[PDB]
């Protein structure tokens, strides 16, 4: 494909019921991402306390819906970055269940 976000937002079913307005894909190993749940505890954007920030910078891609994008013909702008991720963790085992932010 010629647009990573267009391809991935579609194949991961993120354009099925609507165009998900924003989404981040993380390119690190599952183990490295799961490990973040034991790293820096920070407040979640929603005020909950179960968010964790990665000590290391991680390779990520941000996907953001374009202005002309209109469901069901979704369209995205792709932006690559290397940033610390912030994820919300829950459960036993304690694992990532939401992507909160990158910083």
């Amino acid at each position: 494909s010629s647009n990573y976000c267009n391809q991935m937002m579609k194949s991961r079913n993120l354009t099925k019921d609507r165009c998900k307005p924003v989404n981040t894909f993380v390119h690190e190993s599952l183990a490295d991402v799961q490990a973040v749940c034991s790293q820096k505890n920070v407040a979640c954007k929603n005020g909950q306390t179960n968010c964790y920030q990665s000590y290391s910078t991680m390779s990520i891609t941000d996907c953001r819906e374009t202005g002309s994008s209109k469901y069901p013909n979704c369209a995205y702008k792709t932006t690559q970055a290397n940033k610390h991720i912030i994820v919300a963790c829950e459960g036993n085992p304690y694992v990532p269940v939401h992507f909160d932010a990158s910083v």
């Binding site: 991935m8 989404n23 690190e28 991402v33 891609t61 994820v87 990532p96 269940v97």
Partner: peptide, 15 residues
């Protein structure tokens, strides 16, 4: 069916 952990992986993981 899909667990919260599996949904996170589908939405956010691309190794």
């Amino acid at each position: 069916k899909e667990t919260a952990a599996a949904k996170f992986e589908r939405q956010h993981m691309d190794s």
